[PDB]
Design a protein around this ligand. Sequence first.
Ligand SMILES: O=S(=O)(NCCNC/C=C/c1ccc(Br)cc1)c1cccc2cnccc12
Lengths: 336, 20
Amino acid sequence: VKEFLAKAKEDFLKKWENPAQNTAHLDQFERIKTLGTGSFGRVMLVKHMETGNHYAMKILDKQKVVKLKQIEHTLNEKRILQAVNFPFLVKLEFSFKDNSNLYMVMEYVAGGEMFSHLRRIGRFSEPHARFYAAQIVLTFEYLHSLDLIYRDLKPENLLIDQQGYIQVTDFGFAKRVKGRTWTLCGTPEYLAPEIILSKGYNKAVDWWALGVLIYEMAAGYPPFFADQPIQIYEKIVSGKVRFPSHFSSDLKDLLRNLLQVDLTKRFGNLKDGVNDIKNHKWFATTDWIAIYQRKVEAPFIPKFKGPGDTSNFDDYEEEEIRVSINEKCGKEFSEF
Amino acid sequence: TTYADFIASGRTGRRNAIHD
Ligand SMILES: O=S(=O)(NCCNC/C=C/c1ccc(Br)cc1)c1cccc2cnccc12
């Protein structure tokens, strides 16, 4: 581990310092189908005509990123993405830009979102949830070691691959920060109290978010929900959680620690670091080595029927790609 | 039930990220 991460820091640092740019053109890909949508872009199943491969291309409208004041965050995204390398993070294959947008051609993860299966299935058994937790545990342990904060953990951002393993996408709020940070970021249901409480924060928010994840997986719903975010924030900062009667005692106690308002008492943030979690009773059966190697029995395998099969994703209206005769936000994005 | 209470609610679908 410490040795592993040690070697790991070095490749990221090289990449951090000399981030890559413009590794392709639009016309080398064949646009096939929107897999997801968002405030200022859509992810598309795309086909590389020279290789006959499929990727997920993220298309960011430059003007809309500017209107929404998301330039830095967008920059962090591409820079951190091309620099990292772990078995549970999606691979950035290319990036380029045109007069009108920014592109990130990532690897097409066929299994669909975790969100989708969990919604349909209802709730996951502890063992099935634990399979997935362990994978975010290591991923955070890697991420944090590089002074990165993930900041957007939710079922919608975790994808399942052919082998029933996790692939974390969306690094739109990922930030390399040594010391506290202040942006109100994320999804309401997953915000740590410190964040809603405008009090500057660190990595500890990633362990509270994980505490929420495990809860939504095992019980089928978030520990704090209401109809409007203000009502949710209120619940989050109250520090009052009710646990489903079907939660094991070990799970109830992992969750009490992970969802600790007092961040000088919150697991992951303590003296012994990430070991407090990796050594918790709930996890006693987990073989972290076997899991990092992808040699564990995957509890569920979404099966798909061939390349380009997009039946694990919901349908979205197709908006048409428009690329201006005039370069749009040159200076703002020159480092992209 | 909390499950019932959850399905009847407004945030059962894909949750969006809070920017500004
Ligand atoms: O389609 S996705 O975006 N699915 C996971 C993202 N979770 C929902 C967010 C969608 C979204 C899309 C565009 C912007 Br702009 C912001 C959010 C997606 C993103 C990155 C890689 C992917 C690989 N395979 C399938 C899908 C992939």
